[PDB]
Ligand code: HEM
């Protein structure tokens with residue numbers, strides 16, 4: 024129920040312990056006025072400071088002038104902060120506006136087409152994103168709703184994704200959650216305590232070539248549909264062979280415990296863990312921070328199910344791209360399809376009460 | 386606060402404490418073979434007994450024969466029972482199968498068309514429902530996914546809805562949840578503690594005319610979209626006037642406290658509370674047990690959110706129908722739209738370890 028501090032050198036919501044719920048929204052910008060957009064970023068920052076401390080935005084949810092709409096929509100009244108974090112990112116398309124073209128980071132790379140991609144263009148891309156994570160879904164929806172309202176006339180929601188449960192871990196001392204295939208997901212991640220590993224693999228450094236991004240990170244989002252009918256008829260051995268870990272304990276094949284180190288040569292050559300492991304990818308390491316989703320039925324008699332995969336990294340070209348390229352032969356590909364994609368530059372943290380989202384860029 | 390008993394005279398999930406999360410699924414039946422369907426109901430009951438105790442279905446999620454698919458899909462391993470309840474219901478369309486046409490309860494009435502209805506046929510109806518409620522949404526989803534799998538070849542999933550209420554880890558049990566319009570929702574309801582009110586208004590009695598339904602109830606489900614962005618532009622006064630209660634405290638107009646009894650004549654004539662109150666409907670009283678939903682954003686960038694309204698009652702004709710008819714002129718209608726609907730007969734409880742869902746109907 025506690026608050027996660029909002030200010031810092033880095034934005035919260037990355038290294039932070041992974042909260043139970045996600046509401047992710049991508050926005051397109053509809054104003055060509057730079058000053059108007061800067062004013063929005065400041066108003067959003069002010070709102071975020073309220074929201075993440077469990078307070079209502081603006082002058083509150085009630086007790087104002089009867090003839091005015093309340094400043095806050097009110098559905099989070101009486102609720103705790105619930106570890107709400109709000110993380111903003113800027114998409115490549117933003118940099119075509121406001122004279123920003125030459126400030127687009129090299130590390131904000133467009134992704135290549137990957138074999139098997141079936142990307143919905145309507146649920147891909149976006150000028151900007153807001154990741155809202157919290158332990159209470161109502162708290163997360165309230166935050167996104169109120170930001171969108173404040174931004175009316177300057178930004179529109181392009182697409183959104185709710186995540187009902189986490190499929191990631193930045194806290195190895197706590198139980199690793201399972202994805203909808205029934206496997207633990209998050210054992211070998213980067214922990215929030217691993218400052219050296221965060222600095223090496225997650226945070227952008229001044230020397231990487233884009234000074235305004237120092238202390239930021241780069242985000243890849245992939246909406247992945249799971250073929251659960253196909254998976255559910257697979258044998259136990261087939262499932263375990265796909266991953267290279269057993270299902271019950273989630274230990275590497277041959278070993279007894281979840282957190283025993285993988286011995287890659289005992290896994291099938293097309294096992295997911297074997298192909299995704301840093302040692303298979305020249306050391307490339309990601310911070311995975313995704314969530315599960317179900318968006319109803321598929322119209323063919325079955326539940327829809329998927330994973331909204333989020334990865335943070337210091338450079339898209341040295342993080343997600345090499346690892347995904349190496350997944351071209353993954354046994355897991357029989358059971359999944361990527362159907363949405365976006366990339367974002369996640370700026371540095373809001374340093375104090377006078378700072379604002381995007382201040383280093385603008 | 387860990388598990389809710391599965392067995393009882395009544396199915397759990399109606400009068401038992403309201404859990405934080407919902408996964409509601411409607412199923413259509415694909416078999417014409419009564420014996421095959423009965424067999425399914427027995428297998429589903431066996432699975433439900435395991436699921437509600439926090440155990441995997443069948444022989445488990447791992448450790449069986451390597452060359453066999455696991456009996457349980459495994460995504461709830463490591464989780465707690467989470468107060469899971471599984472409540473089954475039978476839709477009117479089920480009664481056109483298996484020779485059951487003369488056993489359809491008269492209280493399982495088809496709803497009339499109501500003004501402003503915009504029902505999506507794909508997210509309406511269904512031969513069967515399973516209401517899965519739990520504090521952890523993964524526990525609920527796991528239940529529905531595994532029931533659907535056990536039933537594959539005999540049933541299909543027609544439509545599915547996830548919902549949320551409060552989060553109990555951080556929110557006191559007594560506090561009334563707010564809906565997504567920002568108003569407290571549930572103040573004047575039937576509580577599961579009110580045994581006599583449940584007998585009067587919720588449970589079917591034998592003398593009501595359908596003996597197999599004694600101890601059961603009737604469910605109306607309505608997927609109600611809110612026009613969030615239009616609502617959020619309304620003034621505070623307009624919003625309070627729509628309901629007849631203030632937004633901060635949720636007190637009736639002219640009163641000080643949430644739980645103060647309303648004075649209906651102080652409210653506007655078409656205020657929601659005034660139109661919905663039992664006194665305005667000949668005493669008709671409902672058990673509301675709905676959940677909020679937020680599914681995403683639509684193609685216009687608007688929030689696809691609302692209330693997945695669930696009401697339990699002793700007879701649809703004397704519960705939901707009169708009350709919803711009375712909402713024809715509700716000021717709230719400007720801001721909502723009913724976009725899905727279904728009705729179900731919820732049979733009596735599973736009495737003991739040898740009983741099974743639907744045993745009073747199938748025999
Ligand atoms: C639906 C899609 C996916 C599923 C179900 C899945 C599942 C898993 C599982 C069960 C593990 C083992 C436990 C762990 O260490 O986390 C794992 C590990 C991993 N996955 Fe995935 N994954 C998916 C997609 C991806 C994608 C798209 C990437 C990257 C492009 C990826 C990268 C990784 C990495 C880096 C590891 C850790 C390998 C190691 O260092 O041991 N996964 N995944």
Ligand code: HEM
Nearest residue numbers: 564568569570571572573609658661662663692708709721
């Ligand atoms: C999105 C749709 C709806 C919203 C936002 C809504 C909201 C509310 C709110 C805020 C209250 C007052 C507090 C309370 O006592 O719970 C209320 C009361 C009530 N509502 Fe609704 N409602 C909706 C739909 C319906 C429908 C479809 C029905 C029935 C057909 C209904 C029946 C009732 C009843 C019976 C009461 C209690 C009245 C009393 O006895 O004081 N509501 N609703």
